Amino acid sequence: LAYNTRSNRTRIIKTPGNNIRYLHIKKLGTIPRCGDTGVPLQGIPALRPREFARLSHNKKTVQRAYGGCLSANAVKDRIVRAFLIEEQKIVKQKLKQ
Amino acid sequence: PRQISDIKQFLEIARRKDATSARIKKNTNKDVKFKLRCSKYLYTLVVADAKKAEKLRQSLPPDLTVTEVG
Amino acid sequence: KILKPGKVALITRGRFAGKKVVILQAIDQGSKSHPFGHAVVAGVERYPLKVTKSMGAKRIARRSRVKPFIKVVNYNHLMPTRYALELDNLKGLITADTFKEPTQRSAARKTVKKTFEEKYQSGKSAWFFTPLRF
Amino acid sequence: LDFSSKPYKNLRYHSRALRDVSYHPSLPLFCSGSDDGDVQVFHGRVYSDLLANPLIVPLKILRNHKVVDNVGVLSTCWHPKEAWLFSAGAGGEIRMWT
RNA sequence: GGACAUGGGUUAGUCGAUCCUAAGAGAUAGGGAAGCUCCGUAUGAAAGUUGCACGAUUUUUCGUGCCUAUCGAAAGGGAAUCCGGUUAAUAUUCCGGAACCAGAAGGUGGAAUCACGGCAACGUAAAUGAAGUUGGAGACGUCGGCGGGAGCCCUGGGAAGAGUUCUCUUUUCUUUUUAACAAACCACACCCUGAAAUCGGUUUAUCCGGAGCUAGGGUAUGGUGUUUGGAAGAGUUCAGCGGCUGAAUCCGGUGCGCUCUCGACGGCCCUUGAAAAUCCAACGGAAG
């Protein structure tokens, strides 16, 4: 593969035959990011998209509502905002009634 | 290669049909290494006292084709 | 002073997030186990499903069956609501030993589930038993 | 400890949470007391030989213990000399199982 | 002679292509043109490879509901392999040893009756999820300084051999290996207590703090490092013997060093920085 590019990221290692050889290291995985905030979620190991399948179900999602897709702070804010908006609709309906 | 530290499970995995060959290594540190070849993984066990090592030689099933140092 | 026994509130943290709970007992004075504004709250983990008269009685009972959850959470984690639910069987059953003994915890959960099923059968606290979308 | 990190065997007879487990220091017996009010007495024979796996069999299921507030047997103790069991209940009753 | 003649020589589940898309190209629908042909690319197309599901079978003549091209990258995206040995010529391909990925069914053991714990961040051997609805990875500019690691370079001893040596020179030169992979452990973002300026913490570079500081306790992410396995049985270097047998293959110290990579920042941006294949998760509660 002439004209080395970003794919050909080689690291030199010392072999047991007292020889220096280059090993191709793949790009590191990225931890999933929260949908709303955009900050990476906590508790999800950063692996490759294909390697994520091998992990167990509990190892990829946090045991909470919207866990693994929305951050806990975002989850708390979303839960609070929905309750307040529901109360406003209830308050407005009573006044309109 | 899983390093195995439990003699009893080394015995049961040897009796299980997946085991094919076993090798015994005697290093300079007077330690005995039991290497068991399985379908996918090579299980090794390090023991330090000879009498337990010899007792586990005769505890291994005779069907297993054990071999001495390489 | 907005927190009183029998008041309906919502949990905003933990695994049981967004679940409506009823304040069984207030521990706002603080405790060694929970050095904060904690209180014992019992909520519903699986809200009852819609009941159709055409469906069988066993199917209706299975749909109406609800799994309760009793835990102690901080005041900040909780979110008080105007509504309040009071039950005779839910008074005096909350104690430190109840949470301490695992067998007592299971018995308390069974009693709470039995009380909730009776309330659902009586057609009361429909808003409390109904799941909330968030 | 010489078999695996996972438990060698699993036993799930108790109808309530298993409270206490105790092994007799000399005799090859052990006991398990739970809140169900029943105590399971098992015999565990340990053999130093590698081939001989431990022989665990039930021996007795002690009953007739009071259960108070969903709590029955709280703790069990083995006699240092013979197969005698001290069982503590929630009602303040101590049963000497000779 | 790269000439001539005669034979030999290129071995892959893991390396590339194959798959995806880019700017564009391009057939189809339609419309032009006497015409060789041209325009046109979801366009006024009935545009669905078995589009999908439902049903004791419905006047044994099918009803109801839902959702609505192809080419173009051997430098972009992407499942997976290392070491030692081996040829006259081929090696991540062959030999020996050791792994990994994808898909496929049953079987065995374990787990729940649609699992628990922790205030919490979240954790664990498991812990069903239809239609329908979303979210994430892929997937994203450039520059500077700092931190981390590896290799290389430098060097102190130790060992080995070869030197030089009237004398001096514990001296001169050379070498001193651990792979993929698999195990256990090893630190900036968030949570809990807390309410702060007499401002504190702190960068090489002053950044943050009642939108909750310092401090204490946690949680996750492990870049890495520790201990092994692999593994000495291999390789290398010295001694020998006639393939065999001996030994050693060690302990450091390091630096604005060079090379490569990762982390944490700080700017400049402006035009705020490809797409798709592919994989995962959430909401949802059909069914049992």
JSON list of C-alpha atoms (C1' of nucleotides) in Angstrom, two decimals, chain E residues 9-15 85-87 89-95:
[
{"chain": "E", "resi": 9, "resn": "G", "atom": "C1'", "xyz": [8.98, -20.14, -9.56]},
{"chain": "E", "resi": 10, "resn": "U", "atom": "C1'", "xyz": [3.77, -16.18, -7.25]},
{"chain": "E", "resi": 11, "resn": "U", "atom": "C1'", "xyz": [-0.27, -21.00, -2.15]},
{"chain": "E", "resi": 12, "resn": "A", "atom": "C1'", "xyz": [-4.35, -16.23, 2.33]},
{"chain": "E", "resi": 13, "resn": "G", "atom": "C1'", "xyz": [-11.60, -17.10, 6.41]},
{"chain": "E", "resi": 14, "resn": "U", "atom": "C1'", "xyz": [-7.72, -12.42, 8.93]},
{"chain": "E", "resi": 15, "resn": "C", "atom": "C1'", "xyz": [-3.24, -8.50, 3.42]},
{"chain": "E", "resi": 85, "resn": "G", "atom": "C1'", "xyz": [11.06, -21.68, 11.02]},
{"chain": "E", "resi": 86, "resn": "U", "atom": "C1'", "xyz": [11.36, -22.73, 5.67]},
{"chain": "E", "resi": 87, "resn": "U", "atom": "C1'", "xyz": [13.17, -21.67, -0.98]},
{"chain": "E", "resi": 89, "resn": "A", "atom": "C1'", "xyz": [13.22, -18.24, -6.89]},
{"chain": "E", "resi": 90, "resn": "U", "atom": "C1'", "xyz": [7.21, -17.31, -2.88]},
{"chain": "E", "resi": 91, "resn": "A", "atom": "C1'", "xyz": [5.44, -15.97, 2.54]},
{"chain": "E", "resi": 92, "resn": "U", "atom": "C1'", "xyz": [1.31, -11.65, 7.75]},
{"chain": "E", "resi": 93, "resn": "U", "atom": "C1'", "xyz": [-0.12, -16.99, 2.24]},
{"chain": "E", "resi": 94, "resn": "C", "atom": "C1'", "xyz": [3.92, -22.45, 3.06]},
{"chain": "E", "resi": 95, "resn": "C", "atom": "C1'", "xyz": [5.65, -25.67, 7.88]}
]
